[PDB]
């Protein structure tokens, strides 16, 4: 029943409220804010930064021309020389500004030697334009690179299963790579999520309890070429020790699964996520194989990635009762 | 009493003195120096690099024009052709330099085919301008990206508490994320800081003693969506084993807490810090919940993040006496 | 017999099929796709992005000139002023577009103050050109940096060997650095690859079984200056415990070896790989030394890197029988 | 006597010879080569790339002008229009090439609409110039960022010492940060380096044997604000277990020390190194303190960083004999 902490696609279902002092923090941590806000708003924010600087300097060059009297004699002559040739109005001043900062510089409109202030504005604008260009480029460059996107081409199975492997009752789920490029330093985690009351009567809204998948022997570290089935041996130390098939079909909990590792190309860590409600766990099932031998290679059939099949010999009791008996 | 090693905001309160050979080291490690020095001074340092190069080449082009006799006939004619059209003085030479290096190139001032030296300067300046532009861009790009800034949007609680959980006396503190973007490969550390004399009579000004929060089982690794309460079970192996409530209110020590993990966007490791003096630790208290169930999601009420409430049933004695008795 | 999971050069021999929904995923994870597709196609893709944008804006400027009547009077006069000087046809419009977006801006063709639409196109194109330039630069920058390339200058030996060291039967293989720059945070892994049927009758096409090389004591972490010989002590916990020399020469399995660590320069993790078929493992052999003392240094003779030599005293039985006897 | 594997400044003293196939590998791993070769040669290599491309296209534009007959009528007239205005010789063609690729584009020399080949060269050169600019920028950007440089501002002590702490005989050495910016995820390693013959008579030129500094409890992980003294408890599992003071003064071995961690700014892992010959280890000594209490802070006196002082109560026998007796 209880709605889920994290969805099948990995997105976490939690909203933060009464975080009143956030704008001051988001300002101090601005580069972070900027790479998170969605494309449309960023490209717009940087369009504004150009437009604003272009209009700003455009105005200054216009003022200089207004004061110097260039608007009445913009081409100059033998006696009179303007600060900037051909600034005859605001649009021309705007054009000169864009031409200068972009560094297009068609040159019909052109700064002269006459006005040290105009020369200074060209100096300052050039330097400002380099700074702004850097900021844009960077933000775009960072945002482009964001390795969270790699989780789209990493795949968890829709279902987890419980079944016997090598004499032990195990929780299992599957993970796969939809690319030729590897996930480097790849390793996995899992957590049981449920509310809990401590023996001292403390209510934990959602306690996160570790699901052991081999950390202590380094077996949480995986080298995934073809899809792999992750194993959680359900034993005395597991929080599913007393969970039988009957319990599972009526119980209310969640199992969050995580795959972390580096995108081979950029060597930046991504974190793929998914989840399994107690209802989505299939007792007495196993995954259908996807790897098979070829003439000169192996092949993975991703059509059979999510598919499972029942195993009647699977005990229906919990792992506690399975050992309590024998 | 004793002033603190690290402040609540994470900044470390230590000054380095008699580090006499630092400038030679800071030069060899220059990129590091440059990204650390504050914005104002960096933007100024790069403004100078442009201005210096602009003035430098400006001077050379002026000298060439002076020697070649272009200052007396800058437009040239049927018989005489200058090295650079329209370099009539220093300002013009300066303008040509800026126009060339920025690559604005209005073109009224324009290099000719006549002087192999002028042609060589345009070649060298162009190449110098690319180098300098790279250096600026980079520094700005690095400095912009600095992931320490992410610690502003990560939150430790103002207080740590001591209380019973699941039959064990525990030190606790809370950590939270003020963003939707995750901290990847997130994990926590803690250290007790105090002076110490060894049995051999050695004085350690500030010994740093580990506060176990689950490293040996990988439980120091956390997946924080909603705020989490970090647990240090106070047992025989803990350095707070013999610390009772009475001791805590009169004792003088510090507990430094660290949260490390990667900014999801850039996948760069940040290190959030805070601290708790013995006085700031609240014995017999617990944190008020912030996570609650909604219709279709969960919600975190950050107004109640720092709030605590007393628990009278909490034993007042140390964990040593708690086990010495039973 | 069975063909190998991963080749000597580290490339994995697996093809993914029936991955039907890949284009939608590869689009959402586009930056990843782009850095993977080989140079030729990327440089072409970015050549198209310029050409397309250049043609696009070229067409718009031409339309403006067509409508405004500039094609009949492109230089303008005392009464008539064009939107863009000297746009006399499509090629001229194309030239103006390239000149503007590249920001070359020769200026013979030059935007005027007359047409707010032309002024707007110059604004939009400039901003589009900055965006596109960023995307190109980035992709090229990422692709250039790709640290997988570092595996070319890291070397596994062609053969693994089995031999006695310090009273224990050990699997061994060698690793080496072909550069002066180090591999930082370097560490090693190994896995036995073979098909397997579980006692419950489940077929695992290729189970991956850990080959212990010292993870639990941190001895998998290596500091490689000169070549190093990696050791897998074959003991009760090893999956080669019951493998004797006779078994090895007739058995069918694979040993995949991995060296992970960061390129000192970029501090990006690379993952060098190789493999050993059961046939490629030389029982009763040891590697010939390559490090020798010099006058003022040490020297590595990479000619003798792969060379081995037999040791008759090596027991021919498995490590199980070696301990079963004594 | 035997010369040392790694020097006090961290540089490793090993030369690689008979690495015959290196150029083909260094080519495949080119980005790596490029960032390693020293500044002077890189800046020169990129100067050549510009010069080469500038000369190349310069030549093509000249050929076009030669064939089209522009060299005889470079300004054009009412009947004749050149491919590129004012290309009157090679220097002019060279100038036009530089002007175009740099995108300075003074414009006196200017491509026309006349020659589709000239228009194509401007297109191709622009695109080539963007590519080359990217390569340069990148290389410079990577090389600039190289985090090895951070090891200059990290400090090992000149000496290691042996002394008693808390009832155990310990090897000790000191590490320090010469910056305000932290080393994130900082941790330490150590290795004993000496030649060795195995009981099976195998000669290991330089075996590397781990010096335990707390890996198994995570105590190798350090949070260094002020300088820290690293401890290696010399016990039964240590390879210095049977080393007494007398042995140390006549013995021949080396102790390599490593500090790894991320530069806070760039979050890139650096690896500081140093070494101690058996002669450089001071038995019965301890380091002088450098941290002392101030009014409102702490202060580190780096003048006393390397200084030690004797402790007569230090046992002169090995840790083996120290426990063999009691
Ligand atoms: C469609 C055009 O929309 P836009 O140009 O904004 O591109 C993205 C789109 O809106 C996605 O739905 C966003 O979220 P997610 O990617 O769906 O989560 C994504 O955010 P991020 O995830 O790129 O910041 C946007 O960048
Ligand atoms: C205000 C304008 O000052 P400025 O433009 O220098 O911007 C920053 C400001 O001065 C902060 O107070 C500095 O320290 P912190 O951020 O407060 O530590 C910060 O340094 P960094 O931390 O950015 O290097 C400065 O960059
Ligand atoms: C030869 C020119 O070919 P191109 O310019 O495409 O350059 C590379 C070449 O084709 C290699 O064979 C490719 O694979 P690998 O490097 O051989 O695997 C490599 O891919 P990546 O590996 O660079 O993406 C190509 O970039
Ligand atoms: C002096 C000018 O010399 P240059 O401009 O070449 O700058 C550096 C200098 O030569 C150092 O001695 C080099 O080695 P190290 O830094 O001393 O090892 C360093 O190499 P890298 O270490 O920068 O590649 C050079 O970049
Ligand atoms: C440009 C910034 C856009 O990013 C914006 O960030 C704020 C702050 O986290 C988010 O706002 C979110 O957190 C604030 C924190 O007080 C809550 O009051 C609000 O209910 C919640 O939606 C916006 O939903 C998001 O659109
Ligand atoms: C531009 C450089 C600015 O960065 C500058 O670095 C030096 C060296 O660490 C700092 O100086 C600091 O360390 C030096 C080391 O000898 C001490 O003498 C000095 O008391 C201390 O303040 C400056 O406080 C800081 O402003
Ligand atoms: C531009 C994209 C080029 O990259 C291209 O990616 C696809 C998708 O992975 C690869 O295609 C590969 O995976 C698809 C997945 O359905 C299979 O149908 C196909 O048999 C296989 O070759 C191409 O071999 C590769 O050339
Ligand atoms: C531009 C390349 C410069 O980098 C160059 O690389 C080669 C190859 O590693 C080095 O050469 C080094 O390794 C080669 C490998 O066969 C040895 O033959 C040579 O004795 C050794 O000095 C050069 O000392 C170095 O100057
Ligand atoms: K121009
Ligand atoms: K970058
Ligand atoms: K220009
Ligand atoms: K011009
Ligand atoms: K330009
Ligand atoms: K121009």
Swiss-Prot record, chains A, B, C, D:
GO molecular function, one term: inward rectifier potassium channel activity
Catalytic activity: K(+)(in) = K(+)(out)
Regulation: Activated by phosphatidylinositol 4,5-bisphosphate (PtdIns(4,5)P2). PtdIns(4,5)P2 binding to the cytoplasmic side of the channel triggers a conformation change leading to channel opening.
Keyword Ion transport: yes
Chief subcellular location: membrane
Record's subcellular location: Membrane; Cell membrane; Cell membrane, Sarcolemma, T-tubule
Binding positions (K(+) 4): 105-106
Binding annotation for K(+) 1: 103
Motif window: Selectivity filter: 103-108
Membrane topology of the entry: Multi-pass membrane protein
Keyword Transmembrane helix: yes
Name of the molecule in the record: ATP-sensitive inward rectifier potassium channel 12
Shown stretch of the complete protein: 41 to 366 of 429
